[PDB]
């Protein structure tokens, strides 16, 4: 009995939107980041895509502290801040993934040289403390 | 149910073989309740020669013996070896059936091969029963689809976990846990396990349920196969050994209690490995356990299962689910310290529930209280949970000393 | 299907035809340790996959287990399998 | 597009004859290896090497009372 195949719960416009927003939020260009961050901050239909954003954040920080890549982390913390101030989406189902990501950012050692990006590392901790508070 | 007769339109057809052009419908009703009355009187008198001459067949010589009995002239030509043929004629509006008789040359009946000569009636004696059962003499009666490889593997692995011996069971579970290619046989194992846990309702076998829960625990330890899709059959089977009330055949002596904490550990593992925010496995398992525990009228076995699963989920669950209803311990000790009804089974289950509750709430009391704990037991319900908490603090101090 | 997988169960049966329950307590912000989840350089791989199941994801399998045997909507029954084909890698 | 766009597409199926032959071959080899190791471990066993049950276990040869019935007769028909 050959049954039919299932479909993903995202559309291909929504899946392409997720791919563009995540490839813009890794901060290759700053204007691209800033729009993508505003798009995260005020898209009303950004629910039902939020598991894939929370998983992308969480998974990213954990394999991004294996080598202490500060920008990758500063961009992800700005993505968390852009996720939080969106008024439409319901976040406390996903905060159990969000909080240990910001915790490590603040309480972790820096595998990259400390002296050069210490001001940004303090800023990264400052972004992490602000989201945590 | 009703008096069944020949149809009235069958008498208009017969009346036109006669030459009667128009026959009114009250005459046709007058004809068919008489001819169907005379059919039933030769149907039931042919049956008196079928029964008195013991035949149970109703040959055509039974009807000819009954037409001879009713004085009516016989029907010639119905003893030859024939059958029931009919030939449909469509026509331009006249629908009928006929015989289509055939012919044969006369010299081909003079020169037919003759049948063999019959034998005369003789007698034969044989024993039917000799002081008991019948002898065995010949005069008596005699008394998508799995390939064959994996069909045989499925048969041997499932019949090794039904309980003939323990060593073949351990090797079968070590096969299930440590083979690389058991996909394409995962839906069969899930169906087998879920239906076998369902078959506990017809036969309350504790042992076969322990074997099926060890089958699920072996299926979880396989690194190669991914049960996220096929775990749907497994979780109700795992939770079956947690929330049902009769897990035993003899309720008093069977330790349904262990299939309870084993399946509770199993469901904590099945919602640690597989709970995702799209799944909502753990929240939906906690909600079933919670509304089974908070709701009254639930038996002490199912409350034991609910408390066991909730306490195997973790520390924050027993903080925010178990600890509000600690006053329920008083409702438990209503039926333990006090009551003429002593010889019922509601005491062993109640103090099992009590022992599990204070064992799991002792580290929770050790986490959220002062280090002294002077009269915490008095402040606690029944003053026993507090003694258990003091014992737990002592155990934690011993563990720290060991470290 | 009586002769299919679970035939052993069918033969054994002998059937031959053919406030702590408040929603917040369960939100995973109040039930998950963020620090514990992180590897933290001490000695995953999912969610970039498109689809899941429906039964396990949606159905109340928790209700499947008749909590009380005497109060059962369904007693011992054939409970025929569906042969419902899905998943993957499966050739057909 | 996100404002009002929906793409109800299907799932790309595997038509690679090479990887399908490899998958069916490796699954058949693994299930027959698992079956023969399980049957050699839960019965009488022989060994080509001295005290060799973990690696290369042989199911022991049992004599039949009527050997032509298990030899000559077809099993799939």
Curated annotation (Swiss-Prot), chain A:
Similarity comment: Belongs to the TAF6 family.
Quaternary structure, from the entry: Component of the TFIID basal transcription factor complex, composed of TATA-box-binding protein TBP, and a number of TBP-associated factors (TAFs), including TAF1, TAF2, TAF3, TAF4, TAF5, TAF6, TAF7, TAF8, TAF9, TAF10, TAF11, TAF12 and TAF13. Interacts directly with TBP, TAF1/TAFII250, TAF9/TAFII31 and TAF12/TAFII20. The TAF6/TAFII70-TAF9/TAFII31 heterodimer forms an octamer complex with the TAF4B/TFII105-TAF12/TFIID20 heterodimer.
Disease linkage: Alazami-Yuan syndrome: An autosomal recessive syndrome reminiscent of Cornelia de Lange syndrome and characterized by delayed psychomotor development with intellectual disability, hypotonia, microcephaly, short stature, poor speech, and dysmorphic features.
Phosphoserine: residues carrying this PTM: 58
Native organism: Homo sapiens
Residues of the full protein shown: 207 to 339 of 677
Known role: The TFIID basal transcription factor complex plays a major role in the initiation of RNA polymerase II (Pol II)-dependent transcription. TFIID recognizes and binds promoters with or without a TATA box via its subunit TBP, a TATA-box-binding protein, and promotes assembly of the pre-initiation complex (PIC). The TFIID complex consists of TBP and TBP-associated factors (TAFs), including TAF1, TAF2, TAF3, TAF4, TAF5, TAF6, TAF7, TAF8, TAF9, TAF10, TAF11, TAF12 and TAF13. The TFIID complex structure can be divided into 3 modules TFIID-A, TFIID-B, and TFIID-C.
Protein name: Transcription initiation factor TFIID subunit 6
Gene that encodes the chain: TAF6
Localization per Swiss-Prot or TrEMBL: Nucleus
Modification Phosphotyrosine occurs at: 47
Residue numbers bearing the Phosphothreonine modification: 42
Swiss-Prot record, chain C:
Domain of life: Eukaryota
Signal peptide feature range: none
Post-translational modification note: Phosphorylated by casein kinase II in vitro.
Subcellular location: Nucleus
Involvement in disorder: Dystonia 3, torsion, X-linked: An X-linked dystonia-parkinsonism disorder. Dystonia is defined by the presence of sustained involuntary muscle contractions, often leading to abnormal postures. DYT3 is characterized by severe progressive torsion dystonia followed by parkinsonism. It has a well-defined pathology of extensive neuronal loss and mosaic gliosis in the striatum (caudate nucleus and putamen) which appears to resemble that in Huntington disease. Intellectual developmental disorder, X-linked, syndromic 33: A syndrome characterized by intellectual deficit, delayed psychomotor development, delayed speech and language, and characteristic facial features.
Function per UniProt: The TFIID basal transcription factor complex plays a major role in the initiation of RNA polymerase II (Pol II)-dependent transcription. TFIID recognizes and binds promoters with or without a TATA box via its subunit TBP, a TATA-box-binding protein, and promotes assembly of the pre-initiation complex (PIC). The TFIID complex consists of TBP and TBP-associated factors (TAFs), including TAF1, TAF2, TAF3, TAF4, TAF5, TAF6, TAF7, TAF8, TAF9, TAF10, TAF11, TAF12 and TAF13. TAF1 is the largest component and core scaffold of the TFIID complex, involved in nucleating complex assembly.
Family of the protein in this entry: Belongs to the TAF1 family.
Domain commentary: The Bromo domain mediates interaction with histones that have acetylated lysine residues at specific positions. The second domain also recognizes and binds histones that are butyrylated and crotonylated.
Name of the featured protein: Transcription initiation factor TFIID subunit 1
UniProt gene name: TAF1
UniProtKB/Swiss-Prot annotation, chain D:
Compartmental location: Nucleus; Cytoplasm
Induction comment from the UniProt entry of this chain: Induced with triglyceride accumulation.
Coiled-coil regions listed in the entry: none
Disease: Neurodevelopmental disorder with severe motor impairment, absent language, cerebral hypomyelination, and brain atrophy: An autosomal recessive disorder with onset soon after birth or in early infancy. Affected individuals do not show developmental progress, are unable to sit or walk, do not acquire speech, have poor visual fixation, and show poor overall growth associated with feeding problems. Additional variable features include seizures, spasticity, and joint contractures. Brain imaging shows hypomyelination, thin corpus callosum, and cerebral and cerebellar atrophy.
Family note: Belongs to the TAF8 family.
Task performed by this protein: The TFIID basal transcription factor complex plays a major role in the initiation of RNA polymerase II (Pol II)-dependent transcription. TFIID recognizes and binds promoters with or without a TATA box via its subunit TBP, a TATA-box-binding protein, and promotes assembly of the pre-initiation complex (PIC). The TFIID complex consists of TBP and TBP-associated factors (TAFs), including TAF1, TAF2, TAF3, TAF4, TAF5, TAF6, TAF7, TAF8, TAF9, TAF10, TAF11, TAF12 and TAF13. The TFIID complex structure can be divided into 3 modules TFIID-A, TFIID-B, and TFIID-C.
Comment field (misc): 'Taube nuss' means 'empty nut' in German.
UniProt domain comment: Ectopic expression of the histone fold domain acts as a dominant-negative mutant resulting in differentiation inhibition.
Name the UniProt record assigns to this protein: Transcription initiation factor TFIID subunit 8
Designated gene of the protein: TAF8
Parent-protein residues present: 156 to 232 of 310
């Amino acid at each position: 009995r050959l049954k039919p195949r299932s479909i993903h719960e995202l559309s291909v416009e929504q899946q392409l939107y997720y791919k563009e927003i995540t490839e813009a939020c890794v901060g290759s260009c700053e204007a691209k980041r800033a729009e993508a961050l505003q798009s995260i901050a005020t898209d009303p239909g950004l629910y039902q895509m939020l598991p894939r954003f929370s998983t992308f954040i969480s998974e990213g920080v954990r394999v991004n502290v294996v080598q202490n890549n500060l920008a990758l982390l500063i961009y992800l913390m700005r993505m968390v801040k852009a996720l939080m101030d969106n008024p439409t989406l319901y976040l406390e189902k996903y905060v159990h993934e969000l909080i240990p990501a910001v915790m490590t950012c603040i309480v972790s050692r820096q595998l990259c040289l400390r002296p050069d990006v210490d001001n940004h590392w303090a800023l990264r901790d400052f972004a992490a403390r602000l989201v945590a508070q | 149910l009703s008096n069944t007769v020949l149809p009235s339109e069958s008498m208009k057809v017969v009346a036109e073989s006669m030459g009667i052009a128009q026959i009114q419908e009250e005459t046709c009703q007058l004809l068919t309740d008489e001819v169907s009355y005379r059919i039933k009187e030769i149907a039931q008198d042919a049956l008196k020669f079928m029964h008195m001459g013991k035949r149970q067949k109703l040959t055509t010589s039974d009807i000819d013996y009954a037409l001879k009995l009713k004085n009516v002239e016989p029907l010639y030509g119905f003893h030859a070896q024939e059958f029931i043929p009919f030939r449909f004629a469509s026509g331009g509006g006249r629908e009928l059936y006929f015989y289509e008789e055939k012919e044969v040359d006369l010299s081909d009946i003079i020169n037919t091969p003759l049948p063999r000569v019959p034998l005369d009636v003789c007698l034969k004696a044989h024993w039917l029963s000799i002081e008991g059962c019948q002898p065995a003499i010949p005069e008596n009666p005699p008394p998508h689809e799995l390939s064959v490889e994996q069909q045989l593997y499925y048969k041997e692995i499932t019949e090794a976990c039904v309980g003939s011996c323990e060593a073949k069971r351990a090797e079968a579970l070590q096969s299930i846990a440590t083979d690389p290619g058991l996909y394409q046989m995962l839906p069969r194992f899930s169906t087998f396990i879920s239906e076998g846990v369902r078959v506990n309702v017809v036969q309350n076998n504790l042992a076969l349920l322990i074997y099926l829960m060890r089958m699920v625990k072996a299926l979880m330890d396989n690194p190669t196969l991914y049960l996220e899709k096929y775990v749907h059959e497994l979780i109700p089977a795992v939770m079956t050994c947690i929330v049902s009330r009769q897990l035993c055949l003899r309720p008093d002596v069977d330790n349904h209690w262990a299939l309870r904490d084993f399946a509770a550990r199993l469901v904590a593992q099945i919602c640690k490995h597989f709970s995702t925010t799209t799944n909502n496995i753990q929240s939906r398992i906690t909600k079933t356990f919670t509304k089974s525990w908070v709701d009254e009228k639930t038996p002490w076995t199912t409350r034991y299962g609910s408390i066991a699963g909730l306490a195997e989920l973790g520390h924050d669950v027993i903080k925010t689910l178990i600890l509000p209803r600690l006053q329920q311990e008083g409702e438990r000790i209503r039926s333990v310290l006090d009551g003429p009804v002593l010889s019922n089974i509601d005491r062993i289950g109640a103090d099992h529930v009590q022992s599990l509750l204070l064992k799991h709430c002792a580290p929770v009391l050790a986490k959220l209280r002062p280090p002294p704990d002077n009269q915490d037991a008095y402040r606690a319900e029944f003053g026993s949970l507090g003694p258990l908490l003091c014992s737990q603090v002592v155990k934690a101090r011993a563990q720290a000393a060991l470290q | 299907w009586r002769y299919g997988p679970a035939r052993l169960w069918y033969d054994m049966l002998g059937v031959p035809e053919d406030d702590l329950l408040a929603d917040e307590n369960f939100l995973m912000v109040t039930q998950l340790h963020w620090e514990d989840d992180i590897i933290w350089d001490g000695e995953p791989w999912y969610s970039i996959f498109p689809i899941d199941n429906e039964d396990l994801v949606y159905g109340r399998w928790e209700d499947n287990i008749i909590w009380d045997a005497q109060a059962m909507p369904r007693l011992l029954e054939p409970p025929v399998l569906t042969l419902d084909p899905n998943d993957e890698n499966l050739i057909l | 597009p996100h404002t009002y766009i929906k793409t109800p597409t299907y799932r790309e199926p595997v038509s690679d004859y090479q990887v399908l032959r490899e998958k069916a071959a490796s699954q058949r080899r693994d299930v027959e290896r698992a079956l023969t190791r399980f049957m050699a471990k839960t019965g009488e066993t022989q060994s080509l090497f001295k005290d060799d049950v973990s690696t290369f276990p042989l199911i022991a040869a049992r004599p039949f009372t009527i050997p032509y019935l298990t030899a000559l007769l077809p099993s799939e028909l």
